[PDB]
Swiss-Prot record:
The modification N-acetylcysteine is found at residue 3. A motif (Nuclear localization signal) lies at residues 23-33. A fatty acid binds at residues 128-130. One of its GO terms (biological process) is long-chain fatty acid transport. The modification Phosphotyrosine is found at residue 21. Coiled coil: none annotated. PROSITE patterns: FABP. It comes from Homo sapiens (Human). This is Fatty acid-binding protein, adipocyte. Keywords: Acetylation, Cytoplasm, Lipid-binding, Nucleus, Phosphoprotein, Transport. The gene is FABP4. Monomer. Homodimer. Interacts with PPARG. One of its GO terms (molecular function) is long-chain fatty acid transmembrane transporter activity.
Length: 133
């Protein structure tokens, strides 16, 4: 029942500072422009200890399945090959991505009827807000 309140289909309703976050991550111009247009759906499900997060978007479709605390390989929407670890900290999913000596952290939390995604790269944050589809 660890992630019950995350389970479902969520649609992006707002984004702030995503372009600057992507710049800080190292995403190139064309990918930033096309990725920034997208209004993805995020589909979260749980089966036993395995959590699956899918992103359905006009830019890129992605899927990760993972066990909390157990590192896995991930190919991000912007095509980075990263090593990811996701934990639960005080009811927040905390996702750390490592690649090329770099690191970024994505936090996912429930707040009222929304799922709020905070992406942090050094000093730069982007906030993406989703509502139930």
């Amino acid at each position: 029942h660890m992630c019950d309140a995350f389970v479902g289909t969520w649609k992006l309703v707002s984004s702030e500072n995503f372009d600057d976050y992507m710049k800080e991550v190292g995403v190139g111009f064309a990918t930033r422009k096309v990725a920034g247009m997208a209004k993805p759906n995020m589909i979260i499900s749980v089966n036993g200890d395995v959590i699956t997060i899918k992103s359905e978007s006009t830019f890129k479709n992605t899927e990760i399945s993972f066990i909390l605390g157990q590192e896995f390989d991930e190919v991000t929407a912007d095509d980075r090959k990263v090593k990811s670890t996701i934990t639960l900290d005080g009811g927040v999913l905390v996702h750390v991505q490592k690649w090329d000596g770099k690191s970024t952290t994505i936090k996912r939390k429930r707040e009222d009827d929304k799922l709020v995604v905070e992406c942090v790269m050094k000093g730069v944050t982007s906030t993406r807000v989703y509502e139930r589809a």
